[PDB]
Write a protein that binds this ligand. Structure first.
Ligand SMILES: Nc1ncnc2c1ncn2[C@@H]1O[C@H](COP(=O)(O)OP(=O)(O)O)[C@@H](O)[C@H]1O
Ligand SMILES: Nc1ncnc2c1ncn2[C@@H]1O[C@H](COP(=O)(O)OP(=O)(O)O)[C@@H](O)[C@H]1O
Ligand SMILES: Nc1ncnc2c1ncn2[C@@H]1O[C@H](COP(=O)(O)OP(=O)(O)O)[C@@H](O)[C@H]1O
Ligand SMILES: [Mg+2]
Ligand SMILES: [Mg+2]
Lengths: 172, 371, 371, 187, 172
């Protein structure tokens, strides 16, 4: 339905935030991430006008840049089974996202948020709009399992290393 | 109702009401987001800052310009900029006022179609019109004949107008403006040991350029003069208390306007561009064009640039012709003043692109009713 | 007479004779002074130590690097290293051999002017010359076209050259190299209880980084693997006999080269800079530059970095072009190797800056005969 | 074409870019039989659009610029010139000759040179001249495939005809008459 | 003998090279400057034919285009006191050069060549054919001194400037 849709090569590099800023206290891991995807799907001028107009309107309803619209959409997105059009509408975004020529770069960016910002903390109880977007990026759906963080409280390589400064002041 | 005029330039936004003599809101067009990780609850709660607020907090932000060389490249940031201009600076509802926008010549056609769409859908303006910046600059000069050299932050372009008729085949455009000069000054400031790499330091370099640069009438004698003594050296204080001193860099940076080969570009200087644009007109209007050079834009207020431009054109033109450069002191706002005049004329109220006319034709209507 | 090539890097000093294949002397560029009071008389005590001898006694010394971020700071210490280089390492007399020096691009002009004065007066060399390190790297590779990424201890820079013609407006520089990584590793090693504060211990950490760190092809996947099992953990033996074990710190340290935001830098990674450098060149030479990425310097010796750069550049470049990364096994001495070749060219012998020429023009003559 | 490719965000300002745009014009442009009709079709669908590969790997697509660029041959008003189109120039060129040879000159339109190589330009020429010409007269366009080198081929013919070796200019003649000899001996 | 010699206003503009090419490793500033001067004195059609030819012959003898001709002229000009005809021809060239309508642009181009590419590095020992030409473009004769370059070692400013990037990797 959207054949011949072209995209800019690096239009989504300037939107990803700083790696440090992904550790802020009042940081948003969903609104920022969707904004990155929203800029990634923008059709360039090379796309013909009739095809370009169709996609723009659809993106303004599933990936809006505003906050009030996103909040209102998220309210009806939890119980998605009562909106058959939204199920069919978003199902279109499955095919375009997985056919995006920059799919791999977005996936590496997508996992960057998961490792640090943690947008997939609910690991299965993710919003229908957000979980479905991630399915296009990675088809296995393994992101629901877990980002595989490290725990080393046991610390099998126990150190007990005394350095120069530690040598100056040491008890016992 | 009162019209609105909004000159979304490459570096600065000028806005105001039609019929006023000066803009009411002037803020830099930058959108910044934090780049460090916040730690205090209840204080870090915003996502992005617009305009002067981004300048004040530039120490912990990444400043991005939503316009690059007169062409809009980040449309969400532009939506934020327009929203801020309409609501927080002018405190008006755009749904009750027609708007007049500005654009450089030879701009991609998609750029103005999206402007029309954003105005007619997101903000729901009753009507809007797009005008070429150089033409408006001539309105705010009390003239109907001359060649306009408009040079802002992104685009330097020439538009020759004779008795109200434009010669589009003689319109010259050049991608060399204030931002390129700031970048060149940043590059050559490392010769004295001053290194600026971040966006905030880019703003610092831009302020230094605004405050301490001037155009030399004769480049080679000026280079000898600065290299023989210390008379031209001046001191500037960085915001942290450090003091920097610059020498020949005062007049080397603006020199790229006349010798673009410094920054690797092949195009000729602004004087040669003006001469070529004039020489592409009809032989019976060159005499009037030589006498009515109009200069406007922020890049135009380097001290003494008018004299240098006049000398260069005199060298290029025949002896019997009289070269006159017109540089009013208010040329930072000539484009905006002209836009205010044009929206205030009684003969203009029939050329607005109305809401109904856009629905019938689509975004392609802005190509027909506008030049 | 035989020419001398002395590459004053930020970390190491490479010296030798033109025409040889490898530098004869490679010693660290540190000067150490004691920080305790001597009590035992009757044995030779020196106020300072230079080079390897300073390393062997680093338990009692305070080591200082007389070069930082590519620019020489402590001139008195810098003079000592040259004196050590000419008399104790090379066993030669500088009054008889010409010397060729190296310098990073975009350094302050005061740095290279002093290098002329300290060699025509303090050591009284017959002649001297200063060359761009990135260009010398290309000479050793036996090419005449490509884009050079030389990353040493202090400065990472790019210099695209086409058919022996450079594009100065496309030269990029970053102050992000091995010394910055060593400081980063010395910080994240505090996560497991390892503390290193003294300059003596920074040398230990610098050795840990060399023998254990590597660049992962995918950062996320590697992070999950190291967090899942203990496959990536490796052991190191400290000089006092204590044993340390590190896991994911092995590939987190060199990742800063691709994500500089770890250390608070706002600049982009090396792969984006290399891509950004190419796009500043002309359209007809981008095809050749993609296939001739040349690397040199110690910071490039990480295992797997060539593959990671190969993967990243491909994504930003169009699908049609072919990306080839050139990493010869001896690229740690590429700059010096090219230096020996260049000083051995018969045609190059007309470009020296003789002693007679310096007395006529002064230290400023180095700005004209040297790029 | 350089001034018109800016309408799609493509910018070309340097001489190497000049050669690139010239190559695009050679390889993609064509002359539309009805400019007004063709302009509607291009704005209606995307059948006319094609793709070209820039030397550095970027891909550009051009639409109505395919036939708006060569239209300047018929409407020099596009680049601001007051002169008339090439078809009307050819028509005027015939009406300035004697009445008895107009019939033959309608039937022998010979065209040559690279700019004449555009696909369909012969048919547009034929249609325009037929529109200008009287209804009885027969308009015939002669467009040999090798017309890109017609001038050179004619030079080769004329330099090999026997009756030509007496129309040369020789150094001995040059020394006597000076550079002014060229107007007297040649046409 | 050379009255009425009119020239194109901008004939020599296309000949001057870019500033970046002046610092080329293999750049003949002398030959490029003489080529610019040669282009600057091209007779136009308005000039009558006999004087036009005469000036063309003089220009070809003194300002050729072939490298061998330039080298031979320079070699034979070392001991110029034995060729009074060359003296007369050079004086005639000076007289027409000094009245060029574009003298100021030619003078500034000569100064640019001297400063950037080092046209006059022998500072008074320059070739004779260059000496009279430069004297024509600039009559003060001050080009014997030199471009008067700048120096940075006098430390007019003690510097000690530490910006953002330099503040991170600060030693001592
Ligand atoms: N006094 C000055 N001297 C030199 N440059 C200036 C001065 N004032 C402003 N500028 C420069 O002019 C540039 C463009 O200003 P402006 O005319 O507002 O651009 P635009 O036409 O895009 O709105 C700015 O980037 C600024 O650096
Ligand atoms: N095998 C290696 N793996 C990783 N880093 C290395 C290796 N060998 C050397 N280095 C690092 O390279 C840095 C710079 O070395 P060098 O190339 O001598 O720099 P310069 O160009 O300044 O002389 C050193 O600080 C060192 O830590
Ligand atoms: N196949 C082609 N289609 C369209 N234009 C062409 C073609 N081949 C050549 N040209 C145009 O013809 C021009 C010159 O061709 P040519 O006849 O050799 O010129 P000249 O007669 O001056 O030698 C070129 O600028 C090119 O734009
Ligand atoms: Mg403006
Ligand atoms: Mg080095």
């Amino acid at each position: 339905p959207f054949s011949g849709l072209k995209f800019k090569q690096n239009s989504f590099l300037s939107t990803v935030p700083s790696v440090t800023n992904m550790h802020s206290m009042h940081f948003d891991a969903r609104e920022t991430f969707l904004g990155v995807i929203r800029k990634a799907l923008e059709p360039d001028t090379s796309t013909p006008f009739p095809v370009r107009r169709a996609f723009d309107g659809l993106r303004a309803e599933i990936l809006p840049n505003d906050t009030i619209k996103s909040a209102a959409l998220k309210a009806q997105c939890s119980d998605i089974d009562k909106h058959p059009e939204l199920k069919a509408k978003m199902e279109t975004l499955k095919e375009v996202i997985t056919h995006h020529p920059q799919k791999e770069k977005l996936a590496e960016i997508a996992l960057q948020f998961a490792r640090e910002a943690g947008l997939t903390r609910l690991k299965g109880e993710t919003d229908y709009v957000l979980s479905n977007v991630l399915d296009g990026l990675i088809g296995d759906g393994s992101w629901r399992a877990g980002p595989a963080y490290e725990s080393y409280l046991n610390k099998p390589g126990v150190d007990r290393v005394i350095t120069t400064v530690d040598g100056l002041h040491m008890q016992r | 109702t009162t019209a609105l005029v909004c000159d979304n330039g490459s570096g600065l936004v000028k806005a105001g009401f039609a019929g006023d003599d000066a803009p009411r809101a002037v803020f830099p067009s930058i959108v910044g987001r934090p780049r460090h990780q916040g730690v205090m609850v209840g204080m870090g709660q915003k996502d992005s800052y617009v305009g002067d607020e981004a300048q004040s907090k530039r120490g912990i932000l990444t400043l991005k310009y939503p316009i690059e060389h007169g062409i809009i490249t980040n449309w969400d940031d532009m939506e934020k900029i327009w929203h801020h201009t309409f609501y927080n600076e002018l405190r008006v509802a755009p749904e009750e006022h027609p708007t007049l926008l500005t654009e450089a010549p030879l701009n991609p056609k998609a750029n103005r179609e999206k402007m029309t769409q954003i105005m007619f859908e997101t903000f729901n303006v009753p009507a809007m019109y797009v005008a070429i910046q150089a033409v408006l600059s001539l309105y705010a000069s009390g003239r109907t004949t001359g060649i306009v050299l408009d040079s802002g932050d992104g685009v330097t372009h020439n538009v020759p107008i004779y008795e109200g008729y434009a010669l589009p085949h003689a319109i010259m455009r050049l991608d060399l403006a204030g931002r390129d000069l700031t970048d060149y000054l940043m590059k050559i400031l490392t010769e004295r040991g001053y290194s600026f790499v971040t966006t905030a330091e880019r703003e610092i370099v831009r302020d230094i350029k605004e405050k301490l640069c001037y155009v030399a009438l004769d480049f080679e004698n000026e280079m000898a003069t600065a290299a023989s003594s210390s008379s031209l050296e001046k001191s500037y204080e960085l915001p942290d208390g450090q003091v920097i001193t610059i020498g020949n860099e005062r007049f080397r940076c603006p020199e790229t306007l006349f010798q673009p080969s410094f920054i690797g570009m092949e195009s000729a200087g602004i004087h040669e561009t003006t001469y070529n644009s004039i020489m592409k007109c009809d032989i019976d209007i060159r005499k009037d064009l030589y006498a009515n050079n109009v200069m406007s834009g922020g890049t135009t207020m380097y001290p003494g640039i008018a004299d240098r431009m006049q000398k260069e054109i005199t060298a290029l033109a025949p002896s019997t012709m009289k070269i006159k450069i017109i540089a009013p002191p208010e040329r930072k706002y000539s484009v905006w003043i002209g836009g205010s005049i044009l929206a205030s004329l009684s003969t203009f109220q029939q050329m607005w692109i109305t809401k109904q006319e856009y629905d019938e034709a689509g975004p392609s209507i802005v190509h027909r009713k506008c030049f």
